[PDB]
Design a protein around this ligand. Sequence first.
Ligand SMILES: Cc1cc(N2CC[C@@](C#N)(C3CC3)C2=O)cc(NC(=O)Cc2ccccc2)n1
Ligand SMILES: Cc1cc(N2CC[C@@](C#N)(C3CC3)C2=O)cc(NC(=O)Cc2ccccc2)n1
Lengths: 486, 486
Amino acid sequence: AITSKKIENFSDWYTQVIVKSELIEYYDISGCYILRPAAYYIWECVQAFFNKEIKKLNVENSYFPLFVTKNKLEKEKNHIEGFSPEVAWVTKYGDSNLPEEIAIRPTSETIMYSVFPKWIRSYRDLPLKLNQWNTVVRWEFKQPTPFIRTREFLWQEGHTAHKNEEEAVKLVFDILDLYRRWYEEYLAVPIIKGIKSEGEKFGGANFTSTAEAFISENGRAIQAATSHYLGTNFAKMFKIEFEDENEVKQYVHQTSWGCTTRSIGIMIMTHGDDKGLVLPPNVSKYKVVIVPIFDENAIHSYCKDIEKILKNAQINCVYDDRASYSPGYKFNHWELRGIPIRIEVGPKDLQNNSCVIVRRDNNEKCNVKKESVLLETQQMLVDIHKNLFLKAKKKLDDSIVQVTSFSEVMNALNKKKMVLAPWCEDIATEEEIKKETQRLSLNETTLSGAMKPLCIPLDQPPMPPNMKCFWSGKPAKRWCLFGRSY
Amino acid sequence: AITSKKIENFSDWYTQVIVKSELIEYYDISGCYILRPAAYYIWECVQAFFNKEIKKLNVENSYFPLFVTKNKLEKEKNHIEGFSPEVAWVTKYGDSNLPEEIAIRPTSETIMYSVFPKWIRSYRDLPLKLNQWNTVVRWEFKQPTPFIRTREFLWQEGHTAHKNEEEAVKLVFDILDLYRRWYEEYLAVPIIKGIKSEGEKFGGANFTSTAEAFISENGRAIQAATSHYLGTNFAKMFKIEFEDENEVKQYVHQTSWGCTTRSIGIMIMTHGDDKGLVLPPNVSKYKVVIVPIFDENAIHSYCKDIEKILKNAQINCVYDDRASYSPGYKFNHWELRGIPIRIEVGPKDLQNNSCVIVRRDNNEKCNVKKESVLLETQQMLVDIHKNLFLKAKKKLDDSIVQVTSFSEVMNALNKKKMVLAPWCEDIATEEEIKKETQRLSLNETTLSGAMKPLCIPLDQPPMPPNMKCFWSGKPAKRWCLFGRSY
Ligand SMILES: Cc1cc(N2CC[C@@](C#N)(C3CC3)C2=O)cc(NC(=O)Cc2ccccc2)n1
Ligand SMILES: Cc1cc(N2CC[C@@](C#N)(C3CC3)C2=O)cc(NC(=O)Cc2ccccc2)n1
């Protein structure tokens, strides 16, 4: 059983759920986690979706080396200043020192763009559109969180190069909406699109667009995915020039974008409850578990009939016919593992040519005739997804408090909210705001009390004529979301 | 153009083909290579096939960490003795030394089996069946070869644990036949199944079964895939015990198996010719390229009609309508890249409601009426695969010389053959044979002249009553394939 309540001890709840549902195994290197089959299956689902969608944009998958030389790694100025203390270095093979130490990729801009100039010489070579499915390493000494913040993680990283700004920026936002769909249609998680503040954008980017999620039970925002307009910054550093149709040398305009197995953690944190994992049907291997209750051969034959009915309509299920466990053990076993639907069959159900169908998300039960099971299961799978999404969306909406003064912020943070505030967007105020909110959090978590700029939402409320910045008192430019975060 | 002939300067031919066909880009770390989209597409095809097939055996995909501790890495005795001098070690993050240095996986037995004992406690937990799609690192200082022998490579590694020997061994050979199908049905490459000699089997294995391929143009064998029966050797080292139905503690019987992007290199070396890449249709993104020859709008409309006909029947193609290049440039451009079929359309073809269809593998051309194109393309794609396979199979068969005495070996090796020889299988003769054949190769390649035991073929000729070992003169046990190798 899960022995900590989600609302009472969130972190212990989370670790219990991910271990006991067999998603995650811990490892003897801190910040590294094993993805067991149930977790990797979710990854494969979203991988298939995203592959299908980026193929329509003519992005092609590729694979680049795990390692980068000092030479290539330092061509980036703001980029390496961002990543340098968490880049892991290989220095030895066996007991012998390498002739030159080499670094493991934290992200692959410097690796890929080292060869982009050979591939791009003319406007005819554009656009160039690549993606990798790989793992990267960011070896930090902050507290890790399984799925959410790890030292090694699986992701996809896309990289494109275009003849001008307009085409690149359009691709940036097309990708951002694909991430919206990845979260909503497969994980049933709502996100907020926005632009990062200057202090929080990717090193080397012109701007960083972002999808933000929020975990209302512990008041913490989590960046769900990211899509950068790099402009010509990397093209200047790596000399990625092309001859345009007027025979003029130009720099390419670049994008890069990423989304990780953090998405799985966001889904777990969003939908999981005190009984364990709750899976949206689109990322659940088994849509239905059939559990018999005890003639035992009549029940066996009936449950296998139902299994045939579901599998014949391409609905994968499992009939838990294990002889040594009670029905209630099985109920709990499969609720912990997040199976969306349980079908129960006892003798009274068989006599009625009926069965009991039980939704994982709200535990509502109903009697369904045998011949109606297929249809009723299909409808229910759809309705479960919608319910999960809508419940999460209400929580997301209820997590935002609009403020005009810093005097309202701490109260909102302590109620596990984010704030939407008018802001002048000056980069120095970012650190000032972080430090003051951290200082004032003195009035249970292990994570920091500091509030960060999360994103400037694409959907802006009107800015009244003379509204001042909630922090500096200077004229406010736009509304920006702030909160504590992972 | 390819400027070296396959038969005259094989290595320069190979490097030209893989670069100019845009499969591979070289990198500023030796032995590491970029897989450009055309190469990665082949990987994705065989990945999809193998996933589908291992799912039928109830193998589940997973993902384990890139890194392993000294602790876990040394529990293996023969395994670490095998891998230790080519294990790469991470010792630093940024400029700070790690508190404990950690190793990059050369293969994941020690990583996965460190946690197997927590997952396997009862006969109810068996069999356990896992697979990973990942990359591994084997940092050797021998000469690398793109695709064939690299310091980092993509692969799949499967690992299973069973209640007894019979079940494990059956899975070993089921996997070996899946590798046979991977090579034959997608890459059109024939292989030879066999068992490794004791000197060549995997460190820690009970036995190693193998699929061997042979490149007749330079006389070199290449191991195509591998499937190990590990017995209880790793179970003893990692204490993977389970309670059986008689309540007796037993060790699991384990398997592990692997197949890499080396398969792509084998395909290139097998089917490539003096014009460049030759792709089996099942791993070619474009099955057909349509090339116009010059009313230009009539030809454009006709070629697009044909493109619609092919794409409507789920046959991906490309219409090369680029205005600045001649037809012959385009012919060569797409032959270099291995497209299986070229359709040419000039005015005489349009007047005849016809077109010219040209096979990449033998350059045979024929006139096909418009309404017959779909059908004729389908048949031709099938026939191209069969032809590629059968041609390769003839070469493989012609590459084996049966000998009874060492006196016949060097002659055969110099004619770019392998030898099938009666052998006593004593492990010390392996090094003796290697050293003597290397010594005698004195009478152009950069690779070693040494001959190795390749495999003991599953399909054995009869062993005559008193046949002696071709090397030691002692009684021969079985026939074994020997040759030079990659
Ligand atoms: C699993 C995961 C994800 C992500 N990040 C980042 C932003 C981003 C987004 N959106 C990426 C661009 C795509 C994301 O998902 C980041 C991470 N580790 C780290 O920062 C390193 C680390 C390790 C231990 C403790 C603290 C920090 N770990
Ligand atoms: C691309 C590839 C493949 C394979 N091997 C091995 C046997 C096997 C088979 N069958 C694996 C078990 C599955 C295979 O494919 C091995 C390798 N590198 C190496 O030995 C390291 C190396 C690096 C530079 C020069 C020389 C050697 N590189």
